[PDB]
């Protein structure tokens with residue numbers, strides 16, 4: 372679910388999902404178009420594609436369970452949708468962690484019309 376994703380993001384990065392990742396760049400948050408602005412935005416692009424791979428799941432609302440083993444996120448076994456949603460969220464949270472070094476506050480609330488270019492999943 373979205374709230375679980377937000378808590379996984381906070382755990383990984385120490386940033387609050389809202390506002391750090393809810394409206395960042397072209398792809399983090401509602402909507403997506405154009406060329407992602409940086410590596411963090413690319414995490415969101417791929418996360419969007421990952422949710423797009425699950426057309427008959429409901430990634431915003433369906434809850435999954437995970438634990439940590441030696442620090443690392445381990446998605447626990449629910450329904451097939453829940454497992455797949457968890458893997459998408461896990462990847463994006465790790466990706467955010469990996470790209471904290473280049474996160475730029477200039478891309479928070481980035482305006483949609485600047486999202487020029489095109490990117491297929």
Ligand SMILES: Oc1ccc(/C=C/c2cc(O)cc(O)c2)cc1
Pocket residue numbers: 373374375376377378388389392393398399400401414415416418419463
């Ligand atoms: O690819 C994406 C990556 C991150 C997000 C952020 C989502 C989000 C939205 C909420 O209302 C609450 C929340 O805790 C998280 C959306 C798309």
